[PDB]
Design a protein around this nucleic acid. Sequence first.
RNA 1: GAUAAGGAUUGGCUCUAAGGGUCGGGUAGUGAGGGCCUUGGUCACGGCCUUGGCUUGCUACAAUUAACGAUCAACUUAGA
Length: 337
Amino acid sequence: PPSYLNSFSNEDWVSSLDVGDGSKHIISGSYDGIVRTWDLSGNVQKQYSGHSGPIRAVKYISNTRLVSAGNDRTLRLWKTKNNIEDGKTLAILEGHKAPVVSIDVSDNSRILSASYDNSIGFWSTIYKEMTVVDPLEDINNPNNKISTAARKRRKLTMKDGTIRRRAPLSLLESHTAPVEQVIFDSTDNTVGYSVSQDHTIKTWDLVTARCIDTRTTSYSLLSIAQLSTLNLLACGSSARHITLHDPRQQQLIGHKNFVSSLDTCPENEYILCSGSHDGTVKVWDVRSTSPMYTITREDKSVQKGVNDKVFAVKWAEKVGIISAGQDKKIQINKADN
RNA sequence: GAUAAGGAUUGGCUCUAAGGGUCGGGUAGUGAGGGCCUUGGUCACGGCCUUGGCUUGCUACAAUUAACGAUCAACUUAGA
């Protein structure tokens, strides 16, 4: 049974989590716009500051590279050096027009971003491979009828230095409602299953940047995970259940609110974890239809319905199950046989 | 119709609410960010980790008659 191992606090809500492929550090995105790296002891190792709004997604690119997204429509690539280290923004990535809520990173140095502008961004880890965008050029080269107030408003957006800005490699635009999550294919690295609020699961041809196949669900979808080793797609919906789809059936029920995040057990082939806005994480066997363990938040000051939500859950193969949400604490559960 | 006239060169008193909106000021020193460079190890021209040289911040003297300038947006003959 997954037992409570350790828990360390934050200043504000935690919205995202990541551990990376092989490492011990925990990456957390918070609602203050600060990205924090932990060393399994509750001590902050690296801080990333500069996002205007709350962070909604963080991902691990390399030992010295991170990518983060937030309410401001800017992906930020962070580069560190290898007490407390302060990372520097390697690049800013623009063009979503609505807050970005999910990111994923592939093997071939590519990024997929899902935002509430019912569109998906196809981005590159290497910023030298993208067209640069000049914020000055909009108001300076034509300079047709831009007022002084508009010019000052535009200038006030560049007070935090002159940081590099890049344009997306492509815009995957077929959804009709905000997109909640997008993931790479665990094998192909060219297939881009995503879920949105328009009741659909869409698969994408990243080479041609178009939608290939669309499946319609009865309720809006909030989280998507892939089980390529047994070829299924688990989509947790706002209807408090997880639907299993065959990307070429069964539904898991028991949650009492929006299912926000999903993850898959790295050592077991049939086990996946789900976090929901009711404050409980649940581990599920694909062959069954009922939760086998239900983790709850271990805190004396937490209230079940007042401030208790799970915005991020992660299956880390070296430390267990990482949960984070409305309570500032980041919770670790054993989840090892 | 106010404002001294209405073929001419129209500009017209003192004090006293408002008179469309907005923006903008120097010379020097040092911190920051970008750009061109370049130097090593590393992975099949391209990455990864490292080395030395237009925007903005902080201080020191002039200007404070910016009583200036710039831009956006409005407007036409009340005479029978």
